[PDB]
Amino acid sequence: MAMFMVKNGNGTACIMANFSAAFSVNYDTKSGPKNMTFDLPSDATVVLNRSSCGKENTSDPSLVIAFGRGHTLTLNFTRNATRYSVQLMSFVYNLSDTHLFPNASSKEIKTVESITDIRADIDKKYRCVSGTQVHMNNVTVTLHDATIQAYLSNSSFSRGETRCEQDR
Amino acid sequence: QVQLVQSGAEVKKPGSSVKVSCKASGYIFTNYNIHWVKKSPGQGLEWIGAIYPGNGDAPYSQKFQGKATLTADTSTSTTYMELSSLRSEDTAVYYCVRANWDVAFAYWGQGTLVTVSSASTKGPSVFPLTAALGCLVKDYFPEPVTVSWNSGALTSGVHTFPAVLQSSGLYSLSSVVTVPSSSLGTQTYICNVNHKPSNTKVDKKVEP
Amino acid sequence: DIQMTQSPSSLSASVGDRVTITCKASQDIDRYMAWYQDKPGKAPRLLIHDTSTLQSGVPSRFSGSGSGRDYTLTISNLEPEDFATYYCLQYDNLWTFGGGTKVEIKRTVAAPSVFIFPPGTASVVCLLNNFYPREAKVQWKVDNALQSGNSQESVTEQDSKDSTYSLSSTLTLSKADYEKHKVYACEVTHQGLSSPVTKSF
């Protein structure tokens, strides 16, 4: 149904998302500061044990995507009676991955976080074709051709949509 | 296993406030809103408002804002609907509904009856009535009363009338049945009236 | 708030007829239109959502249509179990129910079987059993005097199978003004009766 899905106990999707993510990472190298661009690979998968549909009093919905050599992109959701959003986007990247980060002077696992402008009405999906930008420390994450929805009661996207301001 | 269990019936004096509850289970409480809907013979179905438990964000209808107050408690998965300045027009069955906004996934509670009246809980007096046989259930408050025939054996031809409000603020009804004229001597008839509000249980055998 | 103007408020139609209920929203509701069937003592039942999506468990005779501000519910071949109050519900911006449409089932004429029951104070009852149509006149008379303002009437819902009604009329009189009288009559006027039927004592 979607590229990334988080399923509830009864096998029904609670979060569904499509997008192609473009990253830009300024990292510290032995010969200076370097910029690195890459996409979220076509083989990135949903981490089932870290993804959540929410737990009473304990947690809120999350989509955790694992990619490459020890990296994760997380989308944490929040809501009120009528609206919902990705309240926090987390990017965890292993600087010891020599494919994305060659000559890196640090082999540290970096974690960056930011509030996103990804928001939609409840029972509508967020839609952004031109791409939504998330600026974190040294990181820019652009989600292209995005369709994201949380608080789903079915394994299907609602017909209603809340378009991003960038599209118009 | 979605379940919404509403509090029991209430009898409220005019001008008083009432607070009805709705306990949820079988689903993630913070994944949906809880809506409240009034069902009355006078105004049919009316959306009152909804509350997002977890934040407490509550949109109200134009008619019920101020009049109704919705609260939520995530520790016990329970929602509350408080109503102020009670008047006769507030007598109705109030439903709690688990939904976000799409009614395709709405689950309805069993309802809670609120009777607004200054009368006191009084038990009914059971008087007796092809032949037609029955029994009159007079001067009782509040609704409802349950009437069965032959401990539930006699169901065909039974007509239990909707109660009517008398000038005294008390209710009165009749439950009748049409049985063949031959079966009068042989089969005897028992009407079983149960007024749970006053814990009254009266069994009445009907004969001439 | 969005306001829903539902039409008609009432209608009567026979088994096999095509019932059409309309609803008009005060603004474009983008097809977030649903239809509910309301029955006594029961929670409202969803028939259709999304203007025309039939809900699982609902017969194909129920159908929906509409767009913009104007919506219609159609019951193609009316059944006896379809007597109920139907309501539209918009869920585009908050929730708003329509006014309701009471659907009564038309059927052949059936005369009432009239039975009278003899009576602190006095209460004499009169039963009109299984009749159609609903319209009936009950008049109490004690020694040929019209009893104005001392009686209450009560009617059951339509039969699920027959589509008939039954009516009780209860005459409440003070046991002082009851004692002095001896003739207590219940006069029934109905289409199924060539002339008024009196059952007395």
Reported for C8-12, long-range contacts at CB under 8 A and 24+ positions apart, including other chains, are C8/C101, C9/C99, C9/C100, C9/C101, C9/C102, C10/C101, C10/C102, C10/C104, C11/C101, C11/C102, C11/C103, C11/C104, C12/C103, C12/C104, C12/C105, C12/C106
As a whole number of angstroms, the distance between CA C2 and CA C25 comes to 7
Burial of A58 (0-12, 13-18, 19+ CB in 10 A): exposed
b/e sequence A107-140, b meaning 16+ C-beta within 10 Å: eeebebebebebbbbbbbbbbbeebbbbebebbe
C-alpha distances in angstroms, A23 versus A38, A91, A104, A128, C150? 5, 10, 17, 17, 84
Tokens 């539930």 map to which residue? B152
8 Å CB contact of A79 and B52: yes
Contacts of B134 in chain C (CB under 8 A): 117, 127
Q: Name the residue facing C154 among B46, B109, B173 (closest C-beta).
A: B173
Q: How many CB atoms lie within 10 A of CB B120?
A: 11
Q: What is the rounded distance in angstroms from the CA atom of residue C74 to the CA atom of residue A81? A: 33
Alpha helical stretches, state H, C20-174: none
| Strand order across the C184-189 sheet | C137-142, C184-189, C197-200
Residues of chain A neighbouring B58 (CB-CB closer than 8 A): 81
Instruction: Tell me, in Å, the resolution of the deposited structure.
Output: 2.4
**Is C25 strand, coil or helix?**
strand
**SS3 of A43, please?**
coil
Q: Is A82 on the interface with B (CB under 8 A)?
A: yes
**Using CA atoms, how far apart are residues C48 and B148, in angstroms rounded to an integer?**
36
DSSP annotation of C177 reads: H
CA distance A117 to A162: 12
Which residue is listed with tokens 């104007």? C70
Specify whether the CB–CB gap between C163 and C80 falls below 8 A. yes
CA dihedral C96, C101, C103, C104 (to 10 degrees): 130
C-alpha pair distances (Å), B42 with each of A162, B87, B93, C17 = 39, 13, 12, 28
Tokens of A17: 């998302």
Question: Could B55 and A81 be called an inter-chain contact, meaning their C-beta atoms sit closer than 8 Å?
Answer: yes
- Contact status of C143 with chain B (Cβ, < 8 Å): no
DSSP bridge partners of C188? C138, C197
Contacts of A60 in chain B (CB under 8 A): 30
Closest in A54, A81, A158 to B28, CB measured: A54
Taking CA–CA distances from B161, the nearest residue in chain C reads C156
Query: B109 - beta bridge partners?
Result: none
Is the Cβ pair A14, B101 closer than 8 Å?
A: no
Q: How far is CA A96 from the centre of its chain?
A: 22
CB pair distance less than 8 Å for A122 and B58: no
Would you say C134 and C167 are in contact if contact means Cβ atoms under 8 Å apart? no
Domains in chain B, ordered, with CATH? 3-116 (2.60.40.10), 125-206 (2.60.40.10)
- Residues of chain B with Cβ-Cβ distance to C154 below 8 Å are 161-164, 173-174
Tokens of residue A72, six digits: 């994760």
How far apart (Å, rounded) are the C-alpha atoms in residues B95 and B100? 15
Backbone angles phi and psi of C81, in degrees to 5: -75, 0
Element (H, E) at B183: helix B183-186
| Min Cα separation C181/chain B (Å) | 21
Chain A residues lying within 8 Å of B51, measured CB to CB: 81
Q: Which residue has tokens 């209603």?
A: A160
Method: X-ray
The set of chains that have 3 or more CB pairs under 8 A with A is: B
How far apart CA C88 and CA C36 sit, in angstroms, is 6
Residue B49's closest chain A neighbor by CA? A81
Task: Tell me how close the Cα of A140 comes to any Cα of chain B, in angstroms.
Answer: 30
CA pair distance C153, B163, nearest whole angstrom: 10
CA distance B27 to A102: 47
Which domains are seen in chain C, by residue range?
4-106 (2.60.40.10), 113-200 (2.60.40.10)
Cite the beta strand spans of chain A per DSSP E: 4-7, 13-29, 32-39, 45-46, 62-67, 71-79, 83-94, 109-114, 119-121, 125-128, 132-136, 139-150, 161-163
| Single-letter amino acid, residue A107 | K
Which residues in chain C are closer than 8 Å to B50, comparing Cβ atoms? 94-95
Question: How far out from the chain centre does Cα C3 lie?
Answer: 25
Backbone phi, psi, residue A167, to 5°: -70, -20
Other Cβ atoms within 10 Å of B193 Cβ, number: 22
Query: Distance between CA atoms of C46 and A151, rounded to whole angstroms?
Result: 22
